[PDB]
């Protein structure tokens, strides 16, 4: 009983300090910048070959090779320049929700509803792609696999927890807990020592991979958070929920900086990504199109459109040369 | 394509495309169905020709040169709003209700009015006729349905339960196909085949523009 009141006064103190630190909004301080105008992107490539809905996609570190999983049980690796299928990996379970591409390009992990994170080896001496490891230990559907290195991978599940694995041993090295709902998405910081996870309790909290501690937590969303992406310099992140709003939280200030809501937007955000500079906040909605938000004034600086069904995944290359979108109509489109 | 290695890469890509097309052609013969219902309702014991293969459970029995894949979503124990859209393309929903045991009506209401399955027809199975008929004599159908007024006979009670299960439809472009099953029944495959072919006929009718 006393612990409940202690928690209540702790939350009150945290909120009071958080409000005390706030002096001016981002939209007020940066009001003097020239608008970026209208950013028109044209479809340069259209990657076909998938025969079912696409849930995930990841870009190679070299910004030329892709990876995508769909309901057909196929894991296809594309050549984003000449539109060629380098590999075609058949999954054991057709229910897959999260691709991941290794930073070194050697491995590609691909897990989903079947509760395990299958890891595939691309550079084999036999010339084929083999499942190097199959990581088990989660009691719920998997989401947003991310590679730290060639032998370290972070996973998120519907078990209201995130886990850090060791591919060599295959055991759950560290487990992060504290969420009260299904954890839907995570993104790894460029410094590669912290990561943030967006759960179904309308809250995203920052984690530490080394200590396994919840350093920070962020609130403000009215519904389940569906995607998260870090700011390029590793000091902010943008979240997307079914509330049809995007928000920009800052790790140093511990508060949301601005909101990216438009009156004409009804459906929520499925995927969130930034640009290389950190000025365009691209977000995918359920109304079949993506809106490019100028991340400093919250004005729609163009619309991608072009897709027939819901956009399920976004991807911005490391050099920023392209933006690739995947949707449920089994078509990937590359924009520039 | 000018180089030799790029020509070989293009040939490899074309071979992969051909393999993908063949696999997709071979992946259209099957029929994807979804199993649902309360626990201990016989949702895993419909057809004796089971041939299965924590997570998702697949059953791939075949009939009349047609492959039926039953995805039993049981055991997930998570929020259905986040993965139920993975089954948007299922041909039908097989709902199993045990008459010998309100929760089932709640699931049925939730699954029938879901935004993903507004046009997906439902095949409703009422299991354990003998158990229900033996239990109704011992206890009248009034403890769970206090609004009942009709006769306590088996036929009228079963029809009343069927009526309350169909009353939650509340949607056009959807049909509920009903069937009464016992433990010692073998023709469930035939009933599923008729329901699936009827659903396919209706979908083709809608696509062709006839209605």
């Amino acid at each position: 009983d006393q612990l409940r009141q202690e928690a209540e006064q702790l939350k009150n103190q945290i909120r009071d300090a958080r409000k005390a630190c706030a002096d001016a909004t981002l939209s007020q301080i940066t009001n003097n910048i020239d608008p970026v105008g209208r950013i028109q992107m044209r479809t340069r490539r259209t990657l076909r070959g998938h025969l079912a809905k696409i849930y995930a996609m990841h870009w190679g570190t070299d910004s030329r090779l892709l990876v995508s999983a769909s309901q057909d049980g196929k894991l296809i690796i594309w050549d984003s320049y000449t539109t060629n299928k380098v590999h075609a990996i058949p999954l054991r379970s057709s229910w897959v929700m999260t691709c991941a591409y290794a930073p070194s390009g050697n491995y590609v992990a691909c897990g989903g509803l079947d509760n395990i994170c299958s890891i595939y080896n691309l550079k084999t001496r036999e010339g084929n792609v083999r499942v190097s490891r199959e990581l088990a230990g989660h009691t719920g559907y998997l989401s947003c696999c991310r590679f730290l290195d060639d032998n370290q991978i972070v996973t998120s599940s519907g078990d209201t927890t995130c886990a850090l694995w060791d591919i060599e041993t295959g055991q759950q090295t560290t487990t992060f807990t504290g969420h009260t709902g299904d954890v839907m998405s995570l993104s790894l910081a460029p410094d590669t020592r912290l990561f943030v996870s967006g759960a179904c309790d309308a809250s995203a909290k920052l984690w530490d991979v080394r200590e396994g501690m919840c350093r920070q937590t962020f609130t403000g969303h009215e519904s389940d958070i569906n995607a998260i992406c870090f700011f390029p310099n590793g000091n902010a992140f943008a979240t997307g929920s079914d509330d049809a709003t995007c928000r920009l939280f800052d790790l140093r200030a511990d508060q949301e900086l601005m909101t990216y809501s438009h009156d004409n937007i009804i459906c929520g955000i499925t995927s969130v990504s930034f640009s290389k500079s950190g000025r365009l906040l691209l977000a995918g909605y359920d109304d079949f199109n993506c809106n490019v938000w100028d991340a400093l004034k919250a004005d729609r600086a163009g619309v991608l459109a072009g897709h027939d069904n819901r956009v399920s995944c976004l991807g911005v290359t490391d050099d920023g040369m392209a933006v690739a979108t995947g949707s449920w109509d089994s078509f990937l489109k590359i924009w520039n | 394509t000018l180089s030799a290695e790029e020509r070989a890469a293009l040939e490899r890509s074309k071979a992969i495309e051909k393999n993908l097309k063949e696999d997709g052609i071979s992946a259209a013969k099957d029929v994807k169905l979804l199993l649902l219902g309360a626990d201990n309702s016989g949702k895993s014991t419909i057809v004796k020709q089971m041939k299965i293969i924590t997570g998702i459970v697949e059953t791939h029995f075949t009939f009349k040169n047609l492959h039926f894949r039953l995805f039993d979503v049981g055991g997930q124990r998570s929020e259905r709003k986040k993965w139920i859209h993975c089954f948007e393309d299922v041909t039908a929903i097989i709902f199993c209700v045990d008459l010998s045991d309100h929760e089932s009506l709640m699931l049925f209401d939730s699954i029938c009015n879901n935004k993903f399955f507004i046009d997906t027809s439902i095949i409703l199975f009422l299991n354990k006729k003998d158990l229900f008929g033996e239990k109704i004599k011992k206890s009248p159908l009034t403890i769970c349905f206090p609004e009942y007024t009709g006769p306590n006979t088996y036929e009228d009670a079963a029809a009343y339960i069927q009526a309350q299960f169909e009353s939650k439809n509340r949607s056009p472009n959807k049909e509920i196909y009903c069937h009464m099953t016992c433990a010692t029944d073998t023709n469930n495959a035939q009933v599923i085949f008729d329901a699936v072919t009827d659903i396919i006929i209706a979908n083709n009718l809608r696509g062709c523009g006839l209605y």
């Epitope: 380098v86 036999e126 010339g127 | 030799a4 070989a8 890469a9 071979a15």
Partner: single-chain antibody, 233 residues
Framework: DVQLVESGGGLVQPGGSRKLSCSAS????????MHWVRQAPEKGLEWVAY????????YYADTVKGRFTISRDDPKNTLFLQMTSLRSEDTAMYYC??????????????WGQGTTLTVSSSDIVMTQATSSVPVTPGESVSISCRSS???????????LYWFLQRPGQSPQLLIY???NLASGVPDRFSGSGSGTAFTLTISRLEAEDVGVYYC?????????FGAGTKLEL
């Protein structure tokens, strides 16, 4: 273990027909384009034939065009080579080489053990400046070979391959485009080049590194090898 072993060699009379079988075991045979490379006695390597994956595209050398026949048996994991008429110039040690082509692959990594065949009695020209170089261990060595055309394609990839043949063994790939190190070779190797002049350097040479170094172009068929530079100790 990847292993290519071939049989069918021996002494044959001129005008006869002989078939060589290259049996593969240890990799996905159906996904690898396979070549045939012959090495005349103390003369050097020379390309012969190539069959793509699935027997789609097949090429032949101008010397034996219309005279040899190459066939692929994917279920049996066997590669054949049928020759109709044999002259006295066909006597050589025939090698079987696998080649997989995609973005970032190593298309000459593994070579067969070699089979010896004896017979009783426009193109891109690659030239190697020196035929024999004596050197002591621990001293860097520079090997260079030129090409007639500029192998630097429009896509930025230069198709130059450097092979190493230890005495009594089969050639092994070291660098496949300009500096892309092969799988398992020591990191002391390094390669460079610009358009038509290319150089291979070996820092801290070891005693196991002596042999004959071949540079081959893959820009356009028929593939042509260099004269061959031999390291002496």
């Amino acid at each position: 273990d990847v292993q290519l072993v071939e049989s069918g060699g021996g002494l044959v009379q001129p005008g006869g027909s002989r078939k060589l079988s290259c049996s593969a075991s240890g990799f996905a045979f159906s996904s690898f384009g396979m070549h045939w490379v012959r090495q005349a006695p103390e003369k050097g390597l020379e390309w012969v034939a190539y069959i793509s994956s699935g027997s789609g595209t097949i090429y032949y050398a101008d010397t034996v065009k219309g005279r040899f026949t190459i066939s692929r048996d994917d279920p049996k994991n066997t590669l054949f080579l049928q020759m109709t008429s044999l002259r006295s110039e066909d006597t050589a040690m025939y090698y079987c080489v696998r080649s997989i082509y995609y973005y970032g692959s190593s298309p000459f990594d593994f070579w067969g053990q070699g089979t010896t065949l004896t017979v009783s009695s426009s193109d891109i020209v690659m030239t190697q400046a020196t035929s024999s170089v004596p050197v002591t261990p621990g001293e860097s060595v520079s090997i260079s070979c030129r090409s007639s055309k500029s192998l630097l394609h429009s896509n930025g990839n230069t198709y130059l391959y450097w092979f190493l043949q230890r005495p009594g063994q089969s050639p092994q790939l070291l660098i496949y485009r300009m500096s892309n190190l092969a799988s398992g070779v020591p990191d002391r190797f390094s390669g460079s080049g610009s358009g038509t002049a290319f150089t291979l350097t070996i820092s801290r040479l070891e005693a196991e590194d002596v042999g004959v170094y071949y540079c081959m172009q893959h820009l356009e068929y028929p593939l042509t090898f260099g004269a061959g530079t031999k390291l002496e100790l």
